[PDB]
């Protein structure tokens, strides 16, 4: 039972692509085929269009509770 926005917001996409781009750097393994760029932000943003980023988000409701949404299932704009 999870009732929040099904849409990924902008800040969600910023932190997911930031950490995922740092989850590419320091020899970290990549899960899509690449045309050969060296900027990790392009790599992490191509996995967002791939829906291959496995990250689960703990959206803190103000009680202290949270829902576990998945970037695989969140609808980008």
């Amino acid at each position: 039972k999870r009732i929040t926005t099904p849409y990924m917001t902008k800040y969600e996409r910023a932190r997911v692509l930031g950490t995922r781009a740092l989850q590419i750097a320091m020899c970290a393994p990549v899960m899509v085929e690449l045309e050969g760029e060296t900027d990790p932000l392009l790599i992490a943003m191509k996995e967002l269009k791939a829906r291959k980023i496995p990250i689960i988000i703990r959206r803190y409701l103000p009680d202290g509770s949270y829902e576990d949404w998945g970037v695989d299932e969140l609808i980008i704009t």
Binding site: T19, L22, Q23, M26, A28, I55
Partner: protein
């Protein structure tokens, strides 16, 4: 060399002071082992043995059954060096000051006697016991820096 040898060939008989049980750790893991976490955790623990800390009080010598704790790993604010926690049936060693261990001699002279405990502990044993000029017990035990433990006595 830290030798496994079928869970140390069960040297937890009498006269050896070591206790083996489950624990709880805090492993700070690199993002290069996102996939293939098993060799990452066990390689970091191989790069963790033979020194002292608090959750593994005295010193370890082996470990088995590394099982991860929980479903979700923790990614912090800016770091990205992901933090997992481990419960595992450790084989660790309590040094127990006031006990008697074994010795394998390799470098011995009139100034000092070098003997080894478990083939890993470079224990420097002083040769004179103030008896005469013509010629073990434990009182102080402290580790060295680079991945080894030392015994004075």
């Amino acid at each position: 060399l830290p030798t496994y040898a079928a869970a140390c060939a069960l040297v937890n008989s009498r006269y050896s002071c070591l206790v083996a049980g489950p624990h709880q750790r805090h492993i700070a893991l690199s993002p290069r082992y996102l996939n293939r976490k098993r060799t990452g955790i066990r390689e970091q623990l191989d790069a963790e043995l033979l020194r002292y800390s608090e959750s593994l009080l005295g010193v370890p010598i082996a470990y088995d059954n590394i099982k991860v704790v929980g479903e979700l790993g923790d990614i912090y604010d800016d770091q990205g060096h992901i933090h997992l926690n481990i419960e595992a049936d450790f084989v660790i060693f309590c040094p127990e000051p006031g006990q008697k261990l074994m010795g394998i001699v390799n470098k011995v002279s009139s100034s000092h006697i070098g003997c080894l405990v478990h083939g890993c502990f470079n224990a420097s044993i002083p040769k004179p016991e103030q008896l005469s000029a013509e010629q073990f017990e434990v009182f102080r035990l402290d580790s060295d820096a680079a991945g080894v433990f030392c015994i004075r006595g």
